[PDB]
Amino acid sequence: FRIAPEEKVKKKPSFLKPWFGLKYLFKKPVTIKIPYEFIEPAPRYRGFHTLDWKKCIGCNMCGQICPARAIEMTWIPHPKIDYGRCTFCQFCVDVCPTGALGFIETYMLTTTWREEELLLYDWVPIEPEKFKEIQEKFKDYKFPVEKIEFNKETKEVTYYLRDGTTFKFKILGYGL
């Protein structure tokens, strides 16, 4: 049914026809010089999380649809998303009933080998005033938490932001 050729697809080999791949010796080379020409990603690129602390009800509806089992719950009962095991699939956004789990375009996040820079991946996500860390503070599209000082027995994590509030809160207990 609707066989296209009889010998129409098969072409003839040729000696010096590859010189027509040499046409781009003079056109402008199609690259982006990343230091420093920025790219401006999409208006709804899937990125990091921007939980609102006043609409969260702690119903753990997100807990049961995370494909990678990292939206585990804390008490003061909001979730901490860790990006250790998270695929940015954003199934926790359209399943959260109240609407208190958004996503904004922020993907650049580079941390080093030491553990003190690796506590950076355990953050209770902050309010959407972090959109004033995507704009109005040097639009670099990077994770605006940038160090976390956990403390054993005095459990008070400190999201030392770019220049804003240190955002102290206590964490006691996990799960339900």
Residues placed in the known binding site for [4Fe-4S] cluster: 56, 66, 86, 92
Of 14-22, 58-66, 110-118, 121-129, the window that binds ligand SF4 (rule: CB under 6 A) is: 58-66
- Amino acid identity, position 147: K
**For the chain, how many residues are written?**
176
Instruction: Tell me how far apart the alpha carbons of residues 150 and 166 are, in angstroms, rounded to a whole number.
Output: 13
Q: Identify the bridge partners of residue 104 per DSSP, sorted by sequence position.
A: 48
Contact residue for ligand SF4 among 47, 50, 92, 102 (CB under 6 A): 92
Of 19-27, 125-133, 144-152, 166-174, the window that binds another protein (rule: CB under 8 A) is: 19-27
The set of residues, in sequence order, having a beta carbon less than 8 Å from that of 138 and lying 6+ positions away, is: 162
172 binds, among another protein, ligand SF4, none (CB under 5 to 8 A by kind): none
CA distances (Å), 29 to each of 23, 25, 136, 159, in order?
12, 9, 33, 42
Name the residues that contact another protein, by CB under 8 A: 1-5, 9-15, 17-25, 27-35, 38-42, 44-46, 61, 64-69, 82-91, 94-95, 107-113, 118, 121, 141-143
